[PDB]
Structure formats: structure tokens, C-alpha cells
């Protein structure tokens, strides 16, 4: 009910163009009722006078009528095709742009395949409602109103018999249309489910072949595919069950016309001529009634898909504070105030996180697996917000500053390297689009990235594969390091920056890397403790609490956890 | 042509679907004339004995067509859906057999559209055909025969009406097919644009280039809507032309009809019958023209489906291959040379070294040496151009793929976990592995400490990509998963890159203890973790640098000294 009003709600600015569609469809329908009648009426004035008296004169009249009607149906289809695709385009655009506003906390939990299906399949599914189902509806309502007036002109009493079956006609349609939409919605969610396994398995097939999960992922697919088959048949059957079921109601209707025209035919009233004529008038009324009842059932297919489209449009998106402040004259002051954060909100991940970082400081966040180092970084990037605590970037709180200006001041190098499927040049150009080739090539030469780019088939213009897996795992890291160093932020995050990069090449950057790192605040995460030892402040993390703090030399003689961490690198005791 | 093989097992439902349509067309066309025969006898005789008796008979005929109508839908929907459902499972099986290269030939974003949309286009074709597969020819062949007795010498006009109608759909096939293919090609772009923002939303938000991707989507969305209107314009342009030939056909009937009155060949009321037959011929002609429009959309989608099925995988199992029930672990390389692209320089070349079974081997080198690439030759993930790989002093190609891969376990450089739970993810190596077995492997990989400290233990939800955990935890899980499989040949591509130095020690010493008869290989970047191995292997630029003890490589092997220098001085 509500979804239908919202679906047709996208046709609201198109109303001015839609009025013309109603005009052109009515003119072509009136010409489509007169033309088969005129050929049967003028034929009587052909057999009686004969010769070339009236035979070639009527051909020029009919020739212009048939040409005007043929041009009318073409004009109707041409203007509707443009309008149909523009409603589809706007619906597709409104979905992708909603995803860019939606928080990260949706992407990780929901399957990727179902999202793609909701744009590629579900919006291609609402093509059966636009154009074809619109022209036919407006043609359907004019022929129904055009025939009901003809029936009342013949007999008012006999028209009420054909009108008493109309509430029962709407009754059967509403029972079918409710089930048709019910099965078609289930068909689309299982399609998105199947789309989930397709996307997931393809993007990670190398892992599947390695652990020989070929039949296991096949049975995981077949469990959803056989379920899609069982709902698919139910959707298709219910879609095409209304036309033959309505043909039964028509045949039962004509059986009652001959039935009542038998008992009443015994008396002086009701003639043989009156029954045969009223059948012809009821036929011109049943035909649009069958079509309008079927179209309402055929649009349920689109209604079920549009229902999945509005679910994404109803999702709660990222919202900034009304008094959003744009951070001007960024220095690099970072401060945490008794921060407590949990992802599942049940098991607290960060238990009391508090530290002060002055601008232009190299901070080395260190600690064991699953401590909360990446969590402190993610909260700073405002991907997630603190339950009870404060993050003050350059004096102002993280909540008051808009996400748009907060991310403008901070550049990142993620733990799990992600790369776009464009040219190497366009991938490094992310974060700073104003970067010239003189900037790009000099930066890449300093981070040892340019060493392997000049060996590629198209060089800097080599179009990368999805996630850039056509390169070595360390090679990808060096690309992400440059990307952020080109973006030139006042605050930089080097979360697991040189994990897959070798110890020898990592040192070769270090000197040139720090030259670009000076005059900026940088939080570096690494388990290569002997590289991050020269940082201005070292924050040792454990379970999600700050255990040891200060400079390297001070923490070594302390013989605490940092000493236990550092000595563990070298297995020589 | 090969697409029919999937409709072949469901031929019982495929042959009964048009059979019910014949029952339907008879019970709908003959019933109004049969009902009139009851009316005709109702005025001739009347009474309760003739009107009421035929009143029961007319209800029966109405029920036959009703069951015949709904019966046509059921027999066709079951056949159309089962065609698509069996087509998808045969395509997914072929995509599962594909090698990393075959998944990159067709784009990852295109394969999704092929396995879903391109199946649906063919699925709708079977549905559209089955309904008017017997309705279209029987109303055309049976339609002209009824008109043949009415018109004399007007047969030549009917034969001349065939070529302009044939040209109307032949032009729609010539220009249609490449344009309808451009629609399915443009969907692959909006599929890629959405997947790019989905896999790595954190990268888009960090650099605020959300508007850039919004513009990137608008550039591809406009590309799709314009690709649709370009192919669909052919259908719009064919409408005034096809309708005009029907009007021109009626003009030919009226012109030649008046001549027949002068010659006295057709009666005064014979024009009523021929105008009714002319409508049945044109309506049946429109029925062929409608399914042919679905054919051009389906043919463009058929090519995309068939090319995935006919695509030979880069890694194939030999017909006369001998299955290996037991693997000792005798790893050996004989002048192995591999290249990814013909235009580029060789990745690996002149690699020849023998590996003892059970012994731990440390593999070190610079970024872009070929450590991961060489380790991919062992479970047959890549085939070399020159030279051969030998497992148990026998070629890898001669051994069955499913048997060979079952004995070799690996820990990839980029750890990727899948949907389900920790237990559901760990059971990838061996689904037959009982709770007692999977726990001991997790006690080696230190991950068991944390596994139990979750809301449901091993049954704690793991989301696509493992993204619902910490970097090192994904890595810690990945180690235990390879140990679960119980191998005789083990590969550890940067095993503890995202793990602390304390846990790092605990994992390595936990491995040696449980690898007493397993050819273990560890791609390491650290010198103190490389000493734990029996024979240390060195790789640089592509060729093999040195194979021997730590005392030998410091004086003989040149690149080894360079990596060692960055760690000690």
C-alpha cells in the first residue's frame, strides 16, 4: 500500500510530461476503435454502387487515419522510453549515494552480493512497471470508461448484472496480488543471498582451491539455489494464474447471460436479438477489466523489488553535529580522555584510554595481537564513536568537528591494503588530485615504489587488477604508503605500514620517509619494535589498557612489558 | 545450441506445457459457438428438459479450459525455472574450477552478472516461448487454410507479403544483438563501481573522494541507460512500420475486393468472413515478432553464458593421471622458469634445488623476489613455461589435483576468512576433524586462548573477509586452519607478519613440535625466526641465491648479507 505511493512518488516531477502520455494514448485508442468499425460500415457502400465511384476515394481517407495512428503509438513509446530510463537512473543513483552516507558498521555485517543485486537486479526488475505497464494502464482506464457508458445506453437493468460480479472480480484479484508480491519479495532476497555466495566465493577462490572446498561451497550454493528454484516457480505460477482464472470468470459470466436469458425468455420479455447484442457490449468491458486486473498483479513483481530498494533508503546514515566546525590552521594535537569503546557493546574492547600528543610528534603505538591499536586509530578516523570518553583533535572534540573536515586533516595507510582497479598513477593520485607527475614520480622514487612501476607493461598507466593482486603483497604496501604521503596531511596513521615489506627495503625508506614525516603528527603501529624505537612517544598497549609509556631507553631499563616485547624479537638466550 | 542440454532432462514437463495450450485454445474459441448452439435449440424447443440439461454441460467445458489454462502455466514455470536453476549450478561449478587467471579474463564484476542476469534473460525466454510455442504456428497455419477457400488468385499477394515482414525482424537481429550485448556489458561497469566502493569503503571515506566515486557511478549509470535506449530504439522504430504493413495489407484486400464483385467470384457477405480471418493471420504474425524480440536480448546473454562454460581452466587434471593416496614430502625443483605475461621479463628462472622431507626451510628475500610465486608451484596453482616441479620424485601434472592439494596445506600472505563461525572456517582443511583435533591446532597457533574468550566460542560469528576481528587474529586463525588439514608438505607465507614478537616465538616452537614428518616451508622476513630452520633458502630478483646453513650464507650468498645488515649493526 505505502510502497506503491512511494514508487509512483518518483513520477511526481514527470507529471507534466505524463499528462501528454495520457493525451496521446487516448487519441490513439479512440482512433483504434473507429478504424475497425469504419472498414465494416463503408464496405456496404462498395458492393452496392461498385466500380471506381467510392472504391479509390475512401483509400486516401483511411490511408491518412492509419498513418496518424501508427505515428501516435511510435511517439507514445519513444517519449516513454526516455522517461522510464530516467526514473530507473534516479533510483540507481539514489541507492549508491545512500551507501556513501551509510556508516561502515553496515558494510562488514551485511553481505556484499545482496547490495550489488539490490542495484543491478532489483532496479532492472522495476523495468516491467515503467513504459509498457504505464501506456497499457492509461489505455486500459479509457477503454473501460468508454464501454461502461455504452452498456448503460443499451439497458440500465442488464448493466447491474454485469456490475454485481465486479466486487467479486476485485475480491479474487486482491487475494492473488497479495500472494504474488509475497513470493516475488522472497525470490529477490534469496537472489541476493545467492548473489552473496557468488561474489564471496569468486573474490577468494584461490583460498577455496587451496583447501579443496569445491563440493562444500557447491553444496552451500545448492542449498540456496534449490530454495530459489522452489520460490521462483511459486512466483512465476502466481504471476500467470490470474489471466486463465479470469477467463473462467468470463465464461461463467456468459453462461449466466444465456442462463437468465432462458428462464426470462419463456415470458414475453427478453428477445434473441437483445442477448446477442448485450454480449458484444460486455466483451468490450471485460477485455480492459481482465488487463487492468492482470497489470495490477504484474506490477507486484516490481513492487516486491522496489520494497527491497526502500529498505536501503530507510537505513540510518552518518549524521554530523548541526554546529559542524571546519578545522582551519591544523597543527596535529591529539588527546584521549578516559575512552571506553566496544564493537558488540557487550565485551569492552578499550578499557580507559587516555593520552596527550603534542603537534609534530612521532607516536609508536605497540602491543600484542587484538590489543586495540587499530581500534584507537578507527575511533580517531571517526569510523566508530566512544561510548564514554573524549577525543580532542587540536583542542575541539571529535563529535563537534564534522567528519568531512576531520578526515581532511588525517591520511591513512590501512593494516589490510586495498587498491582501486585503475592505472597505478590514478591510484597514487587518490588523496591529492592536484598532484602533478613531477610530485608523483619523485615521491614514488623515495619510497622505492618507482623501482617496480617502470617494469610494468604500460608503466604508470598499467591498469591494476581488482585489489592489485597482480603485484607482490609488499609491493602493494609501498603504493599505499606513497598515496597518503602525497595526500600530505597534518596527522598521519601508519597502521601496520611495513608488515609485508622486507627489513632491508623498510630501512631504505625510513630516512626519506621521516623527512616527509617531520612537521606532522604520526601514529605508527608495528611489531618491528627496533624501527619504531626512535619515536618521540611510545604507547605500549595490552588488552585495551595503556600499560607502559614514554621513550624507548626509559622503558628498557624499566624491565617491564616493553622489555619483554623487545627481547622477544631475538631468540638468543 | 548447447543450452538445450539443460532442458533435455525436464523434457516430460517441456512436452506437456504446449499440450495444455492446445486444450486451452480449443475450449476458448469453440465454447462461444457451442454456447450459441444451446441458445439456438433453446428457442427451437425450449422446456426444462433441454435448457437445464445443457446448463450443466456448459459449466464442465468452462472448467476444462480453466484447468487447461492454469495447467499450461504450472508445466511452463517449472520448466523455465528448472532450466535456469540447473544452468546456474553448472556455471558456478565451472567458475569454481577456474584458475586465478580465468577469473581475471572475464572481470570478477562481469561473472556475477553472467551467473545471475544472463541466466534470467534465458530463463524468461523459455517462459515466453512455452506459452506461445504451439499457439503461434497453429493460429497461423490453421488461420491461412480457413482463408484459402475464400480468396482466389490473392495467394500471390500473400506470398509477396512474406519478404517485407522477414526483413523487419532480420534487421532487428543484425543491429539488435551487438547493442543488446552493450546493455549486459554496461551492467558489468555499474557492478564494478558498486564492488569498488563495497570492498574498501574505509579508503573512500579517509580521502573524502565519495563525490568522485558518486561522479564515477553517474558516468557508468548514464552509460547503462544510454546503452538500453540505443538497443530498445529498434523495437520502438519497428512499431509504426509493422503496423503500417498490416494497414497496407488491408488496402490490398479492399482494392482487389471490389474487382471480385465485378467478376462475381465472392458473395456480398463473404467480405465479413475474410476480414475475420485476416485479423487471425496478423495477430499470429505479431506473436512470432514478439518472441523474436526476446531472442535478440537472450542471444546476447547466451554468448556470455556459453563462453564461461566453454572456457578451459588454466589448471586442468590429466585424463590418465594417477591419484596419490600417500605423499612422503620429497620436494624437488628441476630448472623451473615461470612468466605471467609474454611482454614482461621472467618472474622466476633457473631454480633448481632438492628439499628433504620433514625438514623446516626458511625462505627470505626482497619484496618482488618470487617467494609466494615459487610456493604456488607446489599445490599446482601455476604451471611453469620451462622446467618441471617434482613432488615425491614424480611430476605434479601427472598427479590428480584433488589428491595432491589434499596433502599440501598453506597460510597465504593476505589471510582471507569466509562467512559462518570460527569452527565453520577452521573445518575448511578437514570437515571430518573432530573438536579434540581442531582445539590442539589452535593451542599451537595461540588463537585458542581468544577463541574461548568470545560469546559462543568456536561458534562465534565470522563475517566475510574476517573483517570482524583484528589483523593478527585473522592470521592466527589461518595458521590453525592449515594445521587442521594435517599435511605432509606445509607452506607459511609470512606467518606472523601481524603478530607480536612474544606470540611469534610461541607459534614457531609450537610448529616444530607438531611437524615431525612434514616438509615445512616458512616465508620469513626476520633473521632470528629464520635460524629455527634446518636449511635456509635465499631468493633474489628471481633466480635462486643460495641453499645451505646460516654460517655458509653469510660469506658465500651476497643478498643474504644485505638483509642481515638491516637487522644487525
Amino acid at each position, epitope marked *: 500500500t505505502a510502497t506503491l505511493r512511494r514508487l509512483l512518488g518518483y513520477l511526481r516531477p514527470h507529471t507534466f510530461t505524463l499528462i501528454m502520455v495520457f493525451v496521446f494514448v487516448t487519441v490513439s485508442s479512440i482512433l483504434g476503435v473507429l478504424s475497425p468499425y469504419l472498414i465494416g460500415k463503408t464496405i456496404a457502400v462498395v458492393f452496392v454502387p461498385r466500380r471506381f465511384d467510392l472504391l479509390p476515394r475512401y483509400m486516401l481517407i483511411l490511408g491518412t487515419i492509419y498513418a496518424l495512428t501508427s505515428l501516435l503509438f511510435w511517439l507514445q513509446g519513444k517519449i516513454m522510453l526516455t522517461l522510464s530510463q530516467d526514473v530507473v537512473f534516479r533510483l540507481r543513483k539514489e541507492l549508491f549515494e545512500k551507501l556513501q552516507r551509510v556508516p561502515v558498521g553496515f558494510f562488514d555485517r551485511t553481505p556484499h552480493g545482496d547490495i550489488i543485486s539490490r542495484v543491478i537486479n532489483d532496479v532492472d526488475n522495476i523495468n516491467n512497471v515503467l513504459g509498457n505497464s504505464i501506456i497499457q494502464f492509461f489505455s486500459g482506464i479509457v477503454t473501460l470508461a468508454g464501454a461502461v457508458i455504452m452498456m448503460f445506453r443499451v439497458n440500465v437493468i442488464l448493466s447491474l448484472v454485469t456490475l454485481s460480479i465486479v466486487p467479486l472480480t476485485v475480491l479474487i484479484t486482491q487475494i492473488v496480488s497479495s500472494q504474488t508480491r509475497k513470493y516475488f519479495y522472497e525470490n529477490q532476497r534469496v537472489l541476493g543471498q545467492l548473489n552473496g555466495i557468488i561474489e564471496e566465493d569468486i573474490s577468494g577462490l584461490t583460498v577455496i582451491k587451496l583447501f579443496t572446498r569445491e563440493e562444500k561451497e557447491m553444496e552451500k550454493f545448492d542449498r540456496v539455489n534449490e530454495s530459489l528454484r522452489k520460490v521462483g516457480t511459486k512466483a512465476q505460477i502466481f504471476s500467470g494464474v490470474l489471466p486463465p482464472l479470469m477467463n473462467m470468470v468470463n465464461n461463467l459470466g456468459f453462461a449466466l447471460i444465456s442462463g437468465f436469458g432462458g428462464w426470462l425468455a419463456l415470458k414475453d420479455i427478453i428477445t434473441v436479438g437483445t442477448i446477442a447484442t448485450f454480449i458484444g457490449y460486455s466483451r468490450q468491458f471485460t477485455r480492459p477489466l481482465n488487463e487492468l486486473s492482470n497489470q495490477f498483479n504484474m506490477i507486484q513483481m516490481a513492487l516486491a523489488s522496489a520494497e527491497r530498494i526502500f529498505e536501503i533508503l530507510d537505513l540510518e546514515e552518518e549524521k554530523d553535529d548541526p554546529d559542524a566546525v571546519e578545522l582551519r590552521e591544523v597543527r596535529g594535537e591529539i588527546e584521549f580522555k578516559n575512552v571506553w569503546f566496544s564493537y558488540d557493546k557487550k565485551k569492552p574492547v578499550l578499557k580507559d584510554i587516555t593520552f596527550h600528543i603534542k603537534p609534530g610528534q612521532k607516536v609508536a603505538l605497540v602491543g600484542p595481537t587484538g590489543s586495540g591499536k587499530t581500534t584507537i586509530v578507527n575511533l580517531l578516523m571517526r569510523f566508530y564513536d566512544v561510548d564514554r570518553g573524549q577525543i580532542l583533535v587540536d583542542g575541539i572534540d571529535i563529535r563537534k568537528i564534522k567528519r568531512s573536515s576531520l578526515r581532511s586533516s588525517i591520511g591513512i595507510v590501512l593494516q589490510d591494503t586495498i587498491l582501486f582497479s585503475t592505472t597505478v598513477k590514478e591510484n597514487l593520485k587518490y588523496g591529492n588530485p592536484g598532484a602533478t607527475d613531477e610530485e608523483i614520480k619523485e615521491a614514488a622514487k623515495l619510497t622505492h615504489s618507482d623501482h617496480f612501476i617502470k617494469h610494468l607493461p604500460e608503466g604508470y598507466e598499467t591498469v591494476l587488477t581488482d585489489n592489485g593482486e597482480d603485484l607482490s603483497q609488499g609491493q602493494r604496501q609501498l603504493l599505499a604508503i606513497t598515496r597518503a604521503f602525497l595526500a600530505n596531511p597534518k596527522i598521519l596513521i601508519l597502521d601496520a605500514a611495513t608488515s609485508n615489506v622486507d627489513t632491508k627495503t623498510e630501512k631504505s625508506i625510513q630516512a626519506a620517509m621521516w623527512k616527509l614525516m617531520e612537521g606532522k603528527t604520526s601514529i605508527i603501529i608495528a611489531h618491528r619494535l627496533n624501527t619504531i*624505537k626512535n619515536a618521540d612517544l611510545i604507547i605500549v598497549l595490552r588488552d585495551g589498557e595503556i600499560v607502559e609509556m614514554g621513550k*624507548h*631507553d626509559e622503558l*628498557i631499563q624499566k624491565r617491564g612489558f616493553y622489555y619483554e616485547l623487545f627481547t622477544s624479537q*631475538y631468540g638468543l*638466550v | 545450441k548447447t543450452l538445450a542440454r539443460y532442458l533435455k532432462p525436464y523434457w516430460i514437463f517441456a512436452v506437456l506445457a504446449p499440450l495444455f495450450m492446445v486444450v486451452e485454445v480449443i475450449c476458448d474459441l469453440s465454447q462461444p459457438t457451442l454456447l450459441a448452439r444451446i441458445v439456438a435449440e433453446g428457442i427451437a424447443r425450449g422446456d426444462f428438459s433441454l435448457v437445464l440439461k445443457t446448463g450443466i454441460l456448459m459449466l464442465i467445458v468452462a472448467l476444462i479450459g480453466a484447468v487447461g489454462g492454469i495447467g499450461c502455466t504450472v508445466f511452463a514455470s517449472y520448466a523455465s525455472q528448472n532450466f535456469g536453476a540447473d544452468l546456474r549450478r553448472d556455471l558456478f561449478r565451472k567458475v569454481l574450477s577456474f584458475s586465478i587467471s580465468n577469473v581475471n579474463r572475464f572481470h570478477t564484476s562481469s561473472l556475477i552478472t553472467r551467473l545471475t542476469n544472463d541466466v534470467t534473460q534465458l530463463q524468461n525466454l523459455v517462459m515466453m516461448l512455452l506459452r506461445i510455442v504451439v499457439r503461434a504456428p497453429l493460429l497461423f497455419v490453421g488461420g491461412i487454410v480457413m482463408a484459402v477457400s475464400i480468396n482466389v488468385k490473392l495467394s500471390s499477394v500473400l506470398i509477396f507479403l512474406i519478404p517485407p515482414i522477414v526483413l523487419l525482424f532480420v534487421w532487428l537481429t543484425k543491429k539488435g544483438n551487438p547493442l543488446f550485448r552493450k546493455i549486459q556489458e554496461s551492467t558489468d561497469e555499474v557492478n564494478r563501481v558498486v564492488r569498488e566502493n563495497l570492498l574498501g569503503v574505509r579508503v573512500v571515506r579517509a580521502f573524502r573522494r565519495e563525490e568522485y566515486e558518486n561522479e564515477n557511478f553517474r558516468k557508468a549509470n548514464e552509460s547503462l541507460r544510454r546503452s538500453i535506449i540505443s538497443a530498445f530504439s529498434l523495437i520502438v522504430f519497428a512499431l509504426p512500420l509493422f503496423i503500417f504493413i498490416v494497414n497496407m495489407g488491408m488496402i490490398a484486400v479492399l482494392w482487389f475486393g471490389g474487382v471480385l464483385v465485378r467478376n462475381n467470384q465472392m458473395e456480398i457477405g463473404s467480405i465479413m468472413a475474410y476480414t475475420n480471418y485476416l485479423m487471425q493471420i496478423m495477430f499470429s504474425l505479431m506473436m512470432i515478432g514478439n518472441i523474436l524480440n526476446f531472442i535478440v536480448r537472450a542471444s546476447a546473454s547466451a554468448k556470455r553464458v556459453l563462453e564461461v562454460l566453454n572456457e578451459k581452466p588454466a589448471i586442468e587434471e590429466a585424463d590418465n593421471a594417477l591419484a596419490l593416496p600417500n605423499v612422503e614430502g620429497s620436494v624437488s625443483f628441476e630448472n623451473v622458469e615461470f612468466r605471467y605475461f609474454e611482454n614482461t621479463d621472467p618472474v622466476l628462472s633457473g631454480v633448481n634445488f632438492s628439499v628433504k622431507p620433514g625438514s623446516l626451510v626458511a625462505v627470505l628475500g626482497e619484496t618482488g623476489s618470487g617467494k609466494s610465486t615459487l610456493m604456488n608451484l607446489i599445490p599446482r596453482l601455476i604451471d611453469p613455461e620451462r622446467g618441471r616441479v617434482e613432488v615425491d620424485e614424480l611430476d605434479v601434472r601427472t598427479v590428480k589435483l584433488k589428491d595432491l592439494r589434499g596433502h599440501i596445506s598453506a597460510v597465504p600472505q593476505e589471510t582471507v576468512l569466509f562467512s559462518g563461525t570460527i569452527k565453520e572456517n577452521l573445518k575448511w582443511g578437514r570437515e571430518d576433524a573432530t573438536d579434540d583435533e581442531i582445539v590442539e591446532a589452535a593451542k599451537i597457533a595461540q588463537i585458542h586462548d581468544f577463541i574461548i574468550s568470545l560469546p559462543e566460542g568456536y561458534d562465534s560469528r565470522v563475517e566475510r573477509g574476517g573483517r570482524n576481528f583484528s589483523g593478527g587474529q585473522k592470521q592466527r586463525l589461518s595458521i590453525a586452519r592449515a594445521l587442521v588439514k594435517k599435511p605432509k608438505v606445509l607452506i607459511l607465507d609470512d606467518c606472523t607478519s601481524s603478530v607480536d614478537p612474544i606470540t611469534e616465538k610461541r607459534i614457531l616452537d609450537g610448529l616444530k613440535r607438531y611437524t615431525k614428518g612434514c616438509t615445512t616451508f616458512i616465508i620469513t622476513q626476520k633473521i632470528p625466526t629464520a635460524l629455527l630452520a634446518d636449511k635456509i633458502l635465499v631468493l633474489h630478483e628471481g633466480k635462486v641465491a643460495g641453499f645451505g646453513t646460516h654460517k655458509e650464507l653469510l660469506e658465500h650468498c651476497k643478498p643474504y648479507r644485505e638483509i642481515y645488515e638491516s637487522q*644487525f649493526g
Partner: nanobody
Amino acid sequence: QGQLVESGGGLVQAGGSLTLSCAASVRDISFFAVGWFRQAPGKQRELVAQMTSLRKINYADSVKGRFTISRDDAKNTVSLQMNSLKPEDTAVYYCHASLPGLPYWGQGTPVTVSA
């Protein structure tokens, strides 16, 4: 962990010779650099002999040529041979263990040059 044991020292005549042994217990020298320092009453801890794991020796220009360093990899001990002792050598000699930012110092061997 780390532990350093110093052997030798005592008193010796001017322009003579002496051997200073630095034993490293519960530690393997083969990976970290070896060092030698000295502290005279009113003088800073000035470097004597520094040798990295890759064999690269850097003696101080004021004690250069005269002093010779030795590292026995199978024994796990670092020796410092003294030749022609001057009155400047009258200081408590210390041994040094390197490792990347993780050092350990010696106890101090007594050296007194008589004139």
C-alpha cells in the same frame, strides 16, 4: 637476557703488553656488535674499540694502530690486545654489548700504568 664477565687486568709497566678478555654468558656474540670503553678520574666514557657482527672495526684515532681486537665465535669471548701502554691508559676498562637499541655493560677491569 644478558650477562658480561671480565677477565684479566691488574698492573703493568709502561710500554708493555696486556690481554683483556670479555666473556658473554647466556648470550651469543655472533649476532651483536662488540665494544670497549674506558673511564679515567675526570674523563668521560671514551670508545676504545668497536666491531660490528659483519666484521667492521672502528678504533679511536688517539689509541689507533696500537690496540688489536679479537672475537672467537666458537668460544663466545671478545679479547682486546694492548701494545705499548702510555700514562693515558690509566682507567677502568668496560666491555659493551650492542643489539638494536638493547645494550648491556661490563663490570670494569682494573688497568693502572706505572711510570
